[PDB]
């Protein structure tokens, strides 16, 4: 229709993005002021209404989009669904789920990612890089589970605060992996009772730090290449051959042209 044609161009305008961005920043700034308990009852009521104002502008924004794109058209984008859920959850009447409350209204500032395209790209590259490190992430999960069971059996009776159960052991092994007081706080005290405890903890540190670095480098290198590759697909409109494919086949492509040159030289030398 005509009403669903200008609205899309209003939605796609730089100023509309900037207006929404300004309202996200504003909502975020009022939620930060609401952390101050010394504020007067009138100041709290004022900011709570600016929060209500900000939220209503997001209901108008999402409705404008659902109409101008359609239910199937809007929910076709993962970013729009995320934007929908962020706003729709604020109007959820006693939602049934394992948690505590929804005071986490500050997760509305996470919309700065979906609304700013330079930031949307960064998060997109990182998210697209996750499936590819699933195996490394699972190997790290296996090492933690094996280690947690071993630590609970070995040290739980003598160190119940740190290794009393599986939960306690996963928490202190995560601390050990982060190298946080691993020796002065955990292993030297454990070695006073179990002198060969270093046989367990030093290999655990060696293995988990390498794996977590592997996981992190893997995510970073992939996210960087995916982003670069997507920017090129956006600029030209043509599909970008991933760099790994270009590098894997560089040898094959060079020898083929070397051979095609030699046969063109053979037909040339004898004419």
């Amino acid at each position: 229709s005509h009403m669903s044609r200008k609205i899309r161009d209003l939605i796609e305008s730089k100023r509309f993005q900037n207006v929404i961005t300004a309202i996200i920043v504003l909502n975020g700034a009022v939620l930060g002021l609401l952390t101050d308990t010394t504020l007067s009852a009138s100041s709290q009521n004022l900011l709570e209404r600016v929060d209500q104002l900000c939220l209503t502008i997001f209901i108008v924004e999402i409705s404008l989009k659902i109409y101008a794109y359609g239910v199937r058209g809007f929910f076709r984008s993962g970013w729009n669904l995320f934007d929908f859920v962020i706003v729709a959850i604020a109007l959820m009447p006693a939602q049934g789920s394992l948690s505590v409350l929804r005071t986490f209204r500050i997760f509305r500032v996470m919309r700065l990612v979906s609304v700013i395209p330079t930031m949307r790209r960064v998060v997109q590259g990182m998210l697209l890089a996750l499936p590819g490190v699933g195996s490394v992430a699972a190997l790290l999960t296996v090492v933690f589970y094996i280690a947690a069971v071993m630590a609970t059996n070995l040290y739980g009776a003598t160190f119940p605060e740190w290794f009393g159960d599986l939960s306690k052991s996963l928490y202190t092994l995560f601390q050990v992996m982060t190298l946080e007081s691993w020796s002065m706080g955990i292993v030297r005290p454990v070695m006073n009772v179990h002198p060969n405890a270093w046989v367990f903890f030093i290999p655990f540190i060696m293995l988990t730090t390498l794996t977590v670095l592997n996981l992190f480098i893997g995510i970073i290198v992939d996210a960087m290449a995916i982003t670069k590759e997507q920017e090129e697909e956006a600029k030209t409109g043509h599909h970008q051959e991933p760099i790994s494919q270009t590098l894997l086949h560089l040898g094959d492509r060079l020898d083929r042209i070397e051979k095609q040159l030699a046969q063109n030289n053979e037909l040339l030398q004898r004419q």
Copy 2:
């Protein structure tokens, strides 16, 4: 034979892998529940039998493989030998070795690596990357030994808990390398007695952190390329020229084709 033909296809089926995977997870989950000492005698006896059930399924699995592939055929794979040793050790009657016990039945969860091919590849790439960092690993071992001897001679009489002997010094130098309370916990106290101790510990930290990072980056970069190269060899069936060789000879290959072009141009300009 006919009996050693369908069994191989049963062994190679996705559902058989999934059945074994489910039994590994199950065994791992019952071993984790067995860390809880508050459980009733009947609950402990129940889970211990589910452990026996899981173990028997692995004996049937390995036997099925040894028959369908042969002794020489099965033990030709490093992964199958690993799978054999994991299961066979659970039936080892008082094995003679320097240790304590075999309560580490949880190392059976490490079979998730050998049974899941996406995880088998990750560990394979990492293991194939180790011989190549042997020299860096040995340099780190030399620096630790020299440092341990120096620290024992310099500080062992005044700081016996940390440097009293070689073992004690290797342990606290490893802690120092991990930057764990290196200054507030070790070096500021040591400097109160030996004021120039920083001349020993600051260069030691500078050298070992660079070397350990070198070792780790070396493993990660190699494991990533080896995996990528093996996936390409698996996809096409052709041997993949390692990227280092492609990069080292990129210059040579380009100038050769440049020259072959210039000589083809020379025969063309004068015909």
Copy 3:
């Protein structure tokens, strides 16, 4: 003019650079000696005059440059403007700004960067690499703000020293991100009152360490390539195609020449 021709060649001479370098080192060395409060009143007065001498040589240096290049010519370089501001601020009479004093005369040693070209290049590569990581830096800023608001609401009433307000929470979240006593000092004490606090802090650590590593790797890789690319532009005088462009179009360029070879082969086989 003739007076603004030899001065430029004096300014561009290796010995003039070395003379200025020697005066920066000298000024830096006297400012370091002036940190010693045990010095006699005559020794303090002596060094304070060597500081005055060093400062005057920089006024002569900058004036020499402004004359030999012109106001528009001198201030056309970001490095010269930096050099101008460093020297000009020492003669600022009670400048109006939010601070405390200008005792930070030691920021004059930062001129070793602008005066030594090998060091000017390093800092240049790093500075040119910053706009490109602005989105990652902003994502990290968003995560910190959301987390600070959450931590203030959740823990500020029970842990006011660490989370009492927004400022306090940003400071302890930065400490948590650096892994400094995150568990023994902050989270184990917080968990004694709020047992599921690990649900907040472990994901926060996981997310911020990956993002800060991403930010850092991004800066390092870019600064390294920018420097390499600028050295090549300086050596040849020709514009250097950035490596990302060379890599993105490597596939396209190889298939195009492959096709141009095949069509040259087609005209050759049938002549």
Copy 4:
């Protein structure tokens, strides 16, 4: 001569290298046993003689080399000079230098690097990578000096143990850069007296961690490429074009051959 022909081939034999390697390990193992103060006077005298035996074998080894290569020929290699100095210093009668003693006989184990070629290559690549990071290393040195002077002036009167003088401040800034108790141990106590101290320490941490990572990544990436490039020069005998040069000129080389193809196509289409 004939006597200086077979000795060189004896010196270059795998077994001679292995004999020297075995004597280095042996000397290192006896020096490690000599750290144990509980040993009997006869055991100490025994090991001290095995040290004398090991040292004499190195005097015979070096003399054998100086004769078989010549004074100019032997001292032409940096590795041989290092090997000469390690052995010659053990016979230095009260050498005049600023130190304490030469009990550091364990630095003789550092010969395992010069004697094992796979380890000699690793250290060689690392040493050749140092001149290239000199500017980054100097930038880090400048930041530390500026920071040390600032910290001494700002905090030395109120925190004399940590910032009382320049030496004290460089030591605690190095600790701060390593993130070792930077907040719970240094900055939270400093902020109790100087509440805006975080304005100094948080930027200092941000800047030095990025620079030290830059320095380290720079060394690692260069050492890896230098080693790879030297192995190729050793294998073929031909000079290896450094990868940076191959990558910088990849664009130029591809467009040149693209143009040479188009002109060969132009002469072909009209014959």
